[PDB]
Write a protein that binds this ligand. Structure first.
Ligand SMILES: Cc1cc(OCCCS(C)(=O)=O)cc(C)c1-c1cccc(COc2ccc3c(c2)OC[C@H]3CC(=O)O)c1
Ligand SMILES: CCCCCCCC/C=C\CCCCCCCC(=O)OC[C@H](O)CO
Ligand SMILES: CCCCCCCC/C=C\CCCCCCCC(=O)OC[C@H](O)CO
Length: 434
């Protein structure tokens, strides 16, 4: 179950070669974003980029160690610099990944000083923790009164080992404790945020924003696509071929001599009345009521949308689709509605409403806040994946060999390799490339 030393070498070199440019680009993206705007996510990504670049730069030393079958073939004095450059990022990374995913989650689900403090604390924890254990209890450390270089064990003559032959009785509790705090806790935070991002999308909008998107806003009377006098947020004034009749209905509905021009507050009031009317139209129609009642929130909005555009009786004529919707036969319903004159007359809007019926999500309505929520979900999902795939096995190895010290070194070796590939997968998931 031992990897050939060449395979290990190659795996570390590949992570190094890819990780260096990837993290230089990530740092640059993050640095351009903070400097232009200045946001928490950018700060966490910058710290994650710097830490990954530090890990990256340490990897060639891990590579040559592998080629030497675990022996340290470099000056002994390099071992402490390697110690910090390699393992501080291996623990700090998870903290920054969780922070980023929490920043993205909160910024999108609930739309500077904190960020930097949080990063300082992560760094302070990792450096004091590793430094104090290492400084105190590593071979050559404060407690060692021998002629030993700091961090070097020599299990047999001529065979110095940096870190990896360290007494598990010292290294194990340190690894274990820090893995709980800086991996497993972040993992749970990241999973929580990922779930939160998904729920936020599921209920991240409503009929009002959806119809605003579909209807837009005009303050002066205009002719809709059929040529009827219309105002505000898709408010039909009249079908009549008469501007005066249109002005007269406008004035009546507001309580004022508008002269065909209204404010944004007034348009918003009408819009509210029209949506209530469309909702009341549904509830007093024997064909629409039971369908509406059986529907989740997002699909109710789609049905309200149709009624707002076509009125209760128009929508009630779609008897097959309605039946489908009540039976939760989404795709069958969509196939029917696609054949409608409605789909033929206004296909962009009809596709958006019908897609909303098929999926039950707001994805057809790519508003700024929806895309920000999508962005957040992808970042937390990517973070979850990189936590589980890369530094995950390493930290699980730390936990396992602490609880079961009977375990051999095989699992730790592989966990170190997957941990090193975090320098590749991290910059790819944080979203700051280009
Ligand atoms: C404390 C110190 C002292 C130091 O003196 C150098 C001068 C030598 S002289 C003039 O006095 O002769 C130099 C350094 C860099 C440091 C240091 C500061 C901060 C963190 C770390 C890394 O510490 C680890 C590294 C890995 C591990 C540590 C600690 O614990 C376990 C395992 C991780 C694992 O297996 O998961 C060194
Ligand atoms: C605060 C000291 C932290 C050190 C403890 C290390 C333990 C590692 C666990 C979690 C790190 C991630 C915690 C979540 C940080 C995200 C905060 C955030 O979302 O910031 C938005 C904005 O700045 C708000 O005003
Ligand atoms: C939320 C995460 C909390 C993380 C904190 C838990 C760390 C406890 C480790 C103790 C080591 C002592 C073991 C001594 C056995 C020899």
């Amino acid at each position: 179950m031992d990897l050939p030393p060449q395979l290990s070498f190659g795996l570390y070199v590949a992570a190094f070669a890819l990780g260096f440019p990837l993290n230089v680009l990530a740092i640059r993206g993050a640095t351009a974003h903070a400097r232009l705007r200045l946001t928490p996510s950018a700060v966490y990504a910058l710290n994650l980029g710097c830490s990954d670049l530090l890990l990256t730069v340490s990897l060639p030393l891990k590579a040559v160690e592998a080629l030497a079958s675990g022996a340290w073939p470099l000056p002994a004095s390099l071992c402490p610099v390697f110690a910090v450059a390699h393992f501080a990022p291996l623990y700090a990374g998870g903290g920054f990944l969780a922070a980023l995913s929490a920043a993205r989650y909160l910024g999108a689900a609930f739309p500077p000083c904190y960020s930097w403090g949080v990063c300082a604390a992560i760094w302070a924890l990792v450096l004091c923790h590793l430094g104090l254990v290492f400084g105190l209890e590593a071979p050559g450390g404060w407690l060692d009164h021998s002629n030993t270089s700091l961090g070097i064990n020599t299990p047999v003559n001529g065979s110095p080992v940096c870190l990896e032959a360290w007494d598990p009785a010292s290294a194990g509790p340190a690894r274990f404790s820090l893995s709980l705090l800086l991996f497993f806790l972040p993992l749970a935070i990241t999973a929580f945020c990922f779930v939160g991002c998904l729920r936020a999308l599921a209920r991240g909008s409503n009929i009002f924003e959806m119809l605003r998107i579909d209807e837009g806003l005009r303050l002066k009377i205009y002719k809709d696509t059929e040529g009827y006098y219309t105002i505000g947020i898709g408010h039909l004034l009249t079908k009549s071929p008469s501007l005066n009749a249109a002005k007269s209905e406008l004035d009546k509905a507001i309580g004022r001599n508008t002269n065909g021009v209204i404010t944004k507050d007034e348009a918003e009031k009408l819009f509210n009345q029209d949506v209530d009317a469309a909702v009341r139209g549904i509830l007093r129609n024997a064909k629409l009521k039971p369908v509406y009642d059986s529907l989740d929130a997002v699909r109710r909005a789609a049905l309200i949308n149709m009624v707002f555009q076509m009125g209760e009786t128009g929508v009630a004529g779609f008897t097959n689709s309605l039946r489908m919707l009540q039976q939760k036969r989404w795709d069958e319903a969509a196939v029917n509605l696609a054949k409608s004159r409605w789909y033929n007359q206004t296909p962009n809007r009809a596709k958006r409403v019908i897609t909303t019926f098929r999926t039950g999500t707001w994805d057809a309505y790519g508003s700024l806040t929806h895309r920000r929520k999508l962005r957040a979900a992808w970042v937390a999902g990517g973070a979850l994946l990189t936590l589980l795939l890369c530094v995950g096995p390493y930290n699980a190895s730390n936990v396992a060999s602490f609880l079961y010290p009977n375990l051999g070194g095989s699992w730790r070796k592989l966990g170190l390799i997957t941990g090193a590939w975090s320098v590749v997968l991290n910059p790819l998931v944080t979203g700051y490339l280009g």
